[PDB]
Amino acid sequence: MRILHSMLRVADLEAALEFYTRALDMRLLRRRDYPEGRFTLAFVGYQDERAAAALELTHNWDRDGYTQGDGYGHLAIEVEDAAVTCARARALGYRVTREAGLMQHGRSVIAFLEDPDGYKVELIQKGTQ
Amino acid sequence: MRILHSMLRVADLEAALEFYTRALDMRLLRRRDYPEGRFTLAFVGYQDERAAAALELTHNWDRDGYTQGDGYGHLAIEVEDAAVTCARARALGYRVTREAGLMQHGRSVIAFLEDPDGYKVELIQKG
Ligand code: NI
Ligand SMILES: [Zn+2]
Ligand SMILES: [Zn+2]
């Protein structure tokens, strides 16, 4: 058994893909656009879907946005240097909600970004987790 | 770089753990109280955290529930036999929903399990 993917709904799929690929260096693993169902799916990640869990982004062509609640948390990504990843996001015009630094009560170097839809991305510096 | 985990907030950690460990056969990899923040984290998965992405569960001690929006989709898991997993989940009293005709799943009918907090788990049969 294995975890295959986490799925999120996005208002603008191209804006979403630009964040994941440009700010986070993920690659587009697979994209499928169904005119019969009026939706598109896009799987983004770092390794092939056969090898690791991916992020699935869904866009319903006739929806203009979604309502976020407080149940869903975040997607966490392991990074070489959290300050460097933050500075890249900032330079690209994306939201850094918590700059790289030690976790409130711990020794892990963490940062938080928000993607264009407002979903939280937790960055955890390698070795510190 | 790699994906480390997806995090969901849970109203009752013990109920959530009962679902992920018994209905889904996940292993409790790590769990820790953070008394200063008044929360407990639990990490459930199938492989070691250093090797694969896990599911992080947050239980806030002063909360009884969460307001779910319509943005979050589901977590998908690969299973040996979906029919066996569904039957096992139903025996345990969890809701199973099945969807036919999903364009991205070809001829397959896809089962979704509902966890105690109402989060959906998509079952994808291996092969
Ligand atoms: Ni986390
Ligand atoms: Zn899925
Ligand atoms: Zn699906």
Side-chain angles (χ1 to χ4, degrees):
Chain A
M1 279 172 107
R2 71 188 178 104
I3 293 173
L4 294 172
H5 57 262
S6 177
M7 188 277 271
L8 300 176
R9 298 183 184 89
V10 300
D12 180 332
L13 177 70
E14 285 58 55
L17 288 176
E18 292 309 300
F19 173 83
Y20 291 97
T21 63
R22 297 194 239 176
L24 297 166
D25 299 314
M26 282 186 191
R27 65 187 160 95
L28 180 65
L29 306 170
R30 174 162 58 113
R31 168 172 172 156
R32 299 287 180 268
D33 291 72
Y34 303 96
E36 296 177 83
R38 292 188 64 84
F39 72 98
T40 302
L41 312 177
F43 292 83
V44 288
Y46 299 108
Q47 297 166 76
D48 285 16
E49 280 178 277
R50 275 167 168 269
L55 172 63
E56 182 185 8
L57 303 174
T58 306
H59 172 241
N60 293 293
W61 303 352
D62 311 304
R63 285 288 296 265
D64 293 316
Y66 297 89
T67 299
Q68 298 315 325
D70 65 5
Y72 172 67
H74 52 258
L75 182 74
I77 299 162
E78 179 174 69
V79 298
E80 203 189 57
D81 192 312
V84 166
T85 309
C86 287
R88 185 184 170 115
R90 246 186 224 100
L92 283 159
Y94 298 113
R95 280 176 226 269
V96 177
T97 57
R98 182 195 191 276
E99 174 58 30
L102 296 182
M103 188 183 159
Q104 176 68 63
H105 278 286
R107 290 185 70 206
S108 54
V109 174
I110 297 172
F112 272 90
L113 310 182
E114 270 183 10
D115 75 8
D117 291 87
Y119 295 112
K120 290 188 194 158
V121 177
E122 181 173 60
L123 308 180
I124 306 179
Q125 189 159 307
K126 206 174 159 179
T128 79
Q129 185 166 70
Chain B
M1 271 175 121
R2 68 187 178 106
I3 294 165
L4 291 166
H5 57 257
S6 177
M7 190 277 268
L8 302 176
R9 297 186 181 88
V10 302
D12 181 330
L13 186 59
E14 297 308 318
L17 290 172
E18 263 282 296
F19 171 83
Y20 288 100
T21 66
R22 298 186 71 180
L24 295 165
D25 295 317
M26 290 186 182
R27 292 203 276 139
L28 176 54
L29 302 168
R30 180 156 61 102
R31 176 183 162 146
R32 179 169 169 202
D33 284 347
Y34 287 83
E36 278 286 283
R38 298 193 49 86
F39 66 97
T40 302
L41 300 182
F43 297 85
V44 291
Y46 297 108
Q47 285 87 46
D48 311 329
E49 284 181 279
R50 272 189 216 92
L55 169 63
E56 180 174 52
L57 300 178
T58 303
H59 172 230
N60 286 300
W61 303 352
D62 304 318
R63 297 204 63 155
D64 310 280
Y66 294 89
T67 304
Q68 299 300 332
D70 52 36
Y72 176 62
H74 56 259
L75 182 70
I77 285 161
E78 190 173 71
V79 300
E80 288 305 310
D81 188 332
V84 172
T85 304
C86 293
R88 188 195 174 132
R90 275 187 162 117
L92 291 164
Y94 304 110
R95 182 178 283 274
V96 173
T97 52
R98 292 182 186 158
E99 312 253 17
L102 297 175
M103 316 209 60
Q104 65 268 54
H105 293 286
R107 287 157 88 88
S108 299
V109 169
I110 305 290
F112 300 79
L113 300 188
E114 188 180 300
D115 86 359
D117 287 276
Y119 299 121
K120 289 173 149 189
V121 178
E122 179 173 61
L123 309 181
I124 304 301
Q125 184 155 293
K126 194 180 173 183

mmCIF file of all heavy atoms in Angstrom, chain A residues 5 56, chain B residues 74 122, ligand 2:
data_model
loop_
_atom_site.group_PDB
_atom_site.id
_atom_site.type_symbol
_atom_site.label_atom_id
_atom_site.label_comp_id
_atom_site.label_asym_id
_atom_site.label_seq_id
_atom_site.Cartn_x
_atom_site.Cartn_y
_atom_site.Cartn_z
ATOM 1 N N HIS A 5 -1.558 10.471 -3.796
ATOM 2 C CA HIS A 5 -1.628 11.918 -4.014
ATOM 3 C C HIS A 5 -2.592 12.587 -3.068
ATOM 4 O O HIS A 5 -3.384 11.924 -2.410
ATOM 5 C CB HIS A 5 -2.031 12.291 -5.489
ATOM 6 C CG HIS A 5 -3.340 11.715 -5.965
ATOM 7 N ND1 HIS A 5 -3.372 10.561 -6.741
ATOM 8 C CD2 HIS A 5 -4.608 12.162 -5.811
ATOM 9 C CE1 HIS A 5 -4.648 10.334 -7.010
ATOM 10 N NE2 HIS A 5 -5.427 11.268 -6.493
ATOM 11 N N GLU A 56 -2.187 16.640 -6.687
ATOM 12 C CA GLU A 56 -3.134 16.716 -7.796
ATOM 13 C C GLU A 56 -3.877 18.036 -7.680
ATOM 14 O O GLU A 56 -4.481 18.310 -6.648
ATOM 15 C CB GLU A 56 -4.147 15.568 -7.714
ATOM 16 C CG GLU A 56 -5.097 15.629 -8.908
ATOM 17 C CD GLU A 56 -6.211 14.619 -8.878
ATOM 18 O OE1 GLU A 56 -6.371 13.933 -7.841
ATOM 19 O OE2 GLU A 56 -6.888 14.472 -9.920
ATOM 20 N N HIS B 74 -9.146 15.286 -1.620
ATOM 21 C CA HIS B 74 -9.029 13.966 -0.979
ATOM 22 C C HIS B 74 -7.576 13.553 -0.921
ATOM 23 O O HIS B 74 -6.700 14.249 -1.438
ATOM 24 C CB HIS B 74 -9.826 12.918 -1.810
ATOM 25 C CG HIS B 74 -9.410 12.830 -3.254
ATOM 26 N ND1 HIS B 74 -10.167 13.444 -4.261
ATOM 27 C CD2 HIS B 74 -8.353 12.203 -3.829
ATOM 28 C CE1 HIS B 74 -9.536 13.175 -5.399
ATOM 29 N NE2 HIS B 74 -8.426 12.475 -5.190
ATOM 30 N N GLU B 122 -9.607 8.342 -1.305
ATOM 31 C CA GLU B 122 -9.803 7.649 -2.597
ATOM 32 C C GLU B 122 -8.984 6.368 -2.635
ATOM 33 O O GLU B 122 -7.762 6.365 -2.403
ATOM 34 C CB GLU B 122 -9.345 8.602 -3.709
ATOM 35 C CG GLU B 122 -9.454 8.053 -5.118
ATOM 36 C CD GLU B 122 -9.149 9.098 -6.179
ATOM 37 O OE1 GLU B 122 -8.017 9.625 -6.209
ATOM 38 O OE2 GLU B 122 -10.094 9.487 -6.896
HETATM 39 ZN ZN ZN C 2 -7.438 11.405 -6.661
#
